[PDB]
Design an enzyme around this catalytic site. Structure first.
Site, PDB file in Angstrom:
ATOM      1  N   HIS A  49       8.647 -48.375 -11.436  1.00  0.00           N
ATOM      2  CA  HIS A  49       9.304 -48.660 -10.154  1.00  0.00           C
ATOM      3  C   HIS A  49      10.778 -48.432 -10.199  1.00  0.00           C
ATOM      4  O   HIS A  49      11.419 -48.178  -9.153  1.00  0.00           O
ATOM      5  CB  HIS A  49       8.949 -50.057  -9.654  1.00  0.00           C
ATOM      6  CG  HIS A  49       9.809 -51.160 -10.190  1.00  0.00           C
ATOM      7  ND1 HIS A  49       9.370 -52.024 -11.150  1.00  0.00           N
ATOM      8  CD2 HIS A  49      11.060 -51.549  -9.884  1.00  0.00           C
ATOM      9  CE1 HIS A  49      10.312 -52.892 -11.431  1.00  0.00           C
ATOM     10  NE2 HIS A  49      11.329 -52.657 -10.638  1.00  0.00           N
ATOM     11  N   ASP A  97       2.893 -50.450 -13.649  1.00  0.00           N
ATOM     12  CA  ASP A  97       4.314 -50.338 -13.574  1.00  0.00           C
ATOM     13  C   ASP A  97       4.910 -50.092 -14.967  1.00  0.00           C
ATOM     14  O   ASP A  97       5.538 -50.963 -15.592  1.00  0.00           O
ATOM     15  CB  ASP A  97       4.917 -51.608 -13.002  1.00  0.00           C
ATOM     16  CG  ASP A  97       6.321 -51.415 -12.564  1.00  0.00           C
ATOM     17  OD1 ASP A  97       6.814 -50.273 -12.564  1.00  0.00           O
ATOM     18  OD2 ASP A  97       7.023 -52.419 -12.293  1.00  0.00           O
ATOM     19  N   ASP A 101      14.010 -67.243 -15.222  1.00  0.00           N
ATOM     20  CA  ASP A 101      13.215 -66.070 -14.924  1.00  0.00           C
ATOM     21  C   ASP A 101      13.985 -64.826 -15.311  1.00  0.00           C
ATOM     22  O   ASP A 101      15.171 -64.866 -15.558  1.00  0.00           O
ATOM     23  CB  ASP A 101      12.937 -66.024 -13.435  1.00  0.00           C
ATOM     24  CG  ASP A 101      11.765 -65.179 -13.011  1.00  0.00           C
ATOM     25  OD1 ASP A 101      11.016 -64.552 -13.868  1.00  0.00           O
ATOM     26  OD2 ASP A 101      11.584 -65.097 -11.756  1.00  0.00           O
ATOM     27  N   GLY A 139      17.302 -56.768 -11.548  1.00  0.00           N
ATOM     28  CA  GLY A 139      18.042 -55.856 -12.375  1.00  0.00           C
ATOM     29  C   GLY A 139      17.659 -55.828 -13.880  1.00  0.00           C
ATOM     30  O   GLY A 139      18.221 -55.077 -14.657  1.00  0.00           O
ATOM     31  N   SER A 183      14.474 -55.335 -14.487  1.00  0.00           N
ATOM     32  CA  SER A 183      13.302 -54.450 -14.397  1.00  0.00           C
ATOM     33  C   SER A 183      13.353 -53.406 -15.454  1.00  0.00           C
ATOM     34  O   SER A 183      14.358 -52.747 -15.711  1.00  0.00           O
ATOM     35  CB  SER A 183      13.244 -53.731 -13.045  1.00  0.00           C
ATOM     36  OG  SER A 183      12.934 -54.647 -11.985  1.00  0.00           O
ATOM     37  N   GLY A 184      12.195 -53.210 -16.051  1.00  0.00           N
ATOM     38  CA  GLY A 184      12.041 -52.228 -17.096  1.00  0.00           C
ATOM     39  C   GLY A 184      12.308 -52.735 -18.493  1.00  0.00           C
ATOM     40  O   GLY A 184      11.968 -52.052 -19.459  1.00  0.00           O
TER      41      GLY A 184
HETATM   42  C1  LIG Z   1       6.561 -52.813  -9.135  1.00  0.00           C
HETATM   43  C2  LIG Z   1       7.858 -53.292  -8.490  1.00  0.00           C
HETATM   44  O1  LIG Z   1       7.522 -54.275  -7.509  1.00  0.00           O
HETATM   45  C3  LIG Z   1       8.502 -55.187  -7.136  1.00  0.00           C
HETATM   46  C4  LIG Z   1       8.197 -56.098  -6.059  1.00  0.00           C
HETATM   47  C5  LIG Z   1       9.088 -57.066  -5.631  1.00  0.00           C
HETATM   48  C6  LIG Z   1      10.304 -57.150  -6.306  1.00  0.00           C
HETATM   49  F1  LIG Z   1      11.182 -58.091  -5.898  1.00  0.00           F
HETATM   50  C7  LIG Z   1      10.641 -56.266  -7.372  1.00  0.00           C
HETATM   51  C8  LIG Z   1      12.023 -56.354  -8.043  1.00  0.00           C
HETATM   52  N1  LIG Z   1      11.859 -56.528  -9.507  1.00  0.00           N
HETATM   53  C9  LIG Z   1      11.639 -57.812 -10.032  1.00  0.00           C
HETATM   54  C10 LIG Z   1      11.265 -57.964 -11.394  1.00  0.00           C
HETATM   55  C11 LIG Z   1      11.008 -59.181 -11.922  1.00  0.00           C
HETATM   56  C12 LIG Z   1      11.157 -60.330 -11.105  1.00  0.00           C
HETATM   57  C13 LIG Z   1      10.931 -61.608 -11.635  1.00  0.00           C
HETATM   58  N2  LIG Z   1      10.539 -61.781 -12.929  1.00  0.00           N
HETATM   59  N3  LIG Z   1      11.077 -62.685 -10.875  1.00  0.00           N
HETATM   60  C14 LIG Z   1      11.366 -62.595  -9.591  1.00  0.00           C
HETATM   61  C15 LIG Z   1      11.616 -61.372  -8.985  1.00  0.00           C
HETATM   62  C16 LIG Z   1      11.534 -60.175  -9.762  1.00  0.00           C
HETATM   63  C17 LIG Z   1      11.747 -58.921  -9.225  1.00  0.00           C
HETATM   64  C18 LIG Z   1      12.659 -55.015  -7.780  1.00  0.00           C
HETATM   65  O2  LIG Z   1      12.774 -54.138  -8.632  1.00  0.00           O
HETATM   66  N4  LIG Z   1      13.147 -54.718  -6.556  1.00  0.00           N
HETATM   67  C19 LIG Z   1      13.149 -55.628  -5.375  1.00  0.00           C
HETATM   68  C20 LIG Z   1      14.239 -55.045  -4.418  1.00  0.00           C
HETATM   69  C21 LIG Z   1      14.357 -53.538  -4.822  1.00  0.00           C
HETATM   70  C22 LIG Z   1      13.758 -53.420  -6.265  1.00  0.00           C
HETATM   71  C23 LIG Z   1      12.677 -52.332  -6.304  1.00  0.00           C
HETATM   72  C24 LIG Z   1      11.332 -52.642  -6.062  1.00  0.00           C
HETATM   73  C25 LIG Z   1      10.369 -51.638  -6.068  1.00  0.00           C
HETATM   74  C26 LIG Z   1      10.765 -50.310  -6.301  1.00  0.00           C
HETATM   75  C27 LIG Z   1      12.081 -49.985  -6.562  1.00  0.00           C
HETATM   76  C28 LIG Z   1      13.052 -51.003  -6.555  1.00  0.00           C
HETATM   77  C29 LIG Z   1       9.746 -55.264  -7.823  1.00  0.00           C
END
Ligand SMILES: CCOc1ccc(F)c([C@@H](Nc2ccc3c(N)nccc3c2)C(=O)N2CCC[C@@H]2c2ccccc2)c1
Ligand SMILES: [Ca+2]
Ligand SMILES: [Cl-]
Ligand SMILES: [Cl-]
Ligand SMILES: [Cl-]
Lengths: 250, 58
Positions: free
Chosen positions: A41, A90, A182, A186, A188-189
């Site tokens: 993602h 993902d 948590d 940011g 992510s990955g």
């Molecule tokens: C498979 C990704 O799915 C989703 C779904 C919802 C979602 F909030 C997210 C976000 N990632 C995370 C990861 C871990 C989280 C955690 N441990 N606790 C709470 C929230 C967390 C959020 C994210 O990357 N976003 C959200 C705003 C634009 C960006 C995005 C999302 C998707 C694509 C590109 C950028 C991914």
């Protein structure tokens, strides 16, 4: 990372920072000198695949200390089953353009065998998650790399304890439902790293959740054990022209 | 010993074999000791070890 602490410099030596045009995109995990595992993602909005940089040995984003090593990302490999803008599958495997040099500050995390990960690692309660993500929901991101210890849940328990995407067999929950601690957007990955008998292994990838340390909700992580054979096969493959590669899964 | 219980006693990876047989194995950058279970690094920077802590405990 909400509710963790600074990872002392060099104690998270597998952590990758991904940049696009110099801006923080996501984290990742080094698993060999040329291979990084991140989240699919992370790449859903990439326009110029050629401005993606991975940085190893990073700690404090405000300074250069000479332990950083930057490389271009030559290949971003995503499973055919991943659908942009959705949660399942993902994971991304990134090939660097040139190997990193292993040092005290740059070390791969072990990519475990499937059976080991399923039979043993999946039952280790706590594991570390890390990144330069938001320190608070709706807050600024971290300048120093952060790390948090999070306990893993069986998915049946996650679903019971939580109160919108399914938690599929390609995911697992970890963390806390009380809003204190948590990983967030940011991060992510980045890695979910699991210690077993003196060695650390890759078990998850920071993937998704609700908000960030939102009461009633756990972090959701890609279940890397589902992808070991997929990853290993791709690591034995020749590179292909064009950065993005969609590869069949399984 | 079976790999599903206590990791077959292996430090790292475990294969079940026909018989009451089990073989432990180690990741690249490690070798298996004569105990048949323990793995010891064979390179300077084996995966999953934190050098500044390994040197803190050497
Ligand atoms: C498979 C990704 O799915 C989703 C779904 C919802 C979602 F909030 C997210 C976000 N990632 C995370 C990861 C871990 C989280 C955690 N441990 N606790 C709470 C929230 C967390 C959020 C994210 O990357 N976003 C959200 C705003 C634009 C960006 C995005 C999302 C998707 C694509 C590109 C950028 C991914
Ligand atoms: Ca720095
Ligand atoms: Cl090939
Ligand atoms: Cl391209
Ligand atoms: Cl050595």
């Amino acid at each position: 990372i909400v509710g963790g602490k600074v990872c002392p410099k060099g104690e998270c030596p597998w952590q990758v920072l991904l940049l696009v045009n110099g801006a923080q995109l996501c984290g990742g995990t080094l698993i060999n000198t040329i291979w990084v595992v991140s989240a699919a993602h992370c790449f859903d909005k990439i326009k110029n695949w050629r401005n993606l940089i991975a940085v190893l040995g990073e700690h404090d984003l405000s300074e250069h200390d000479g332990d950083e090593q930057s490389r271009r990302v030559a290949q971003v490999i995503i499973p055919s089953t991943y659908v942009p803008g959705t949660t399942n599958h993902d994971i991304a495997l990134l090939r660097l353009h040139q190997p990193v040099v292993l040092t005290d500050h740059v070390v791969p995390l072990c990519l475990p065998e499937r059976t080991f990960s399923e039979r043993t690692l999946a039952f280790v309660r706590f594991s570390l998650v890390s990144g330069w993500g938001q320190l608070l929901d709706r807050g600024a991101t971290a300048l120093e790399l952060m790390v948090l210890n999070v306990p893993r849940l069986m998915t049946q328990d996650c679903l019971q304890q939580s109160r919108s995407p399914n938690i599929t067999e390609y995911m697992f929950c970890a963390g806390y439902s009380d809003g204190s601690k948590d990983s967030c957007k940011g991060d992510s990955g980045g890695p979910h790293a699991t210690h077993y008998r003196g060695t650390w292994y890759l078990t998850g990838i920071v993937s998704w959740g609700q908000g960030c340390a939102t009461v009633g909700h756990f972090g959701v992580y890609t279940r890397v054990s589902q992808y070991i054979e997929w990853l290993q096969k791709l690591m034995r493959s020749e590179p292909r022209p064009g950065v993005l590669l969609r590869a069949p899964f399984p | 010993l079976i790999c599903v219980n206590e990791n077959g006693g292996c430090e790292q990876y475990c294969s079940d074999h026909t018989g009451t047989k089990r073989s432990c194995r180690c990741h690249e950058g490690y070798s298996l000791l004569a105990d048949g279970v323990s793995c010891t690094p064979t390179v300077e920077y084996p995966c999953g070890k934190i050098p500044i802590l390994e040197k803190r405990n050497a």
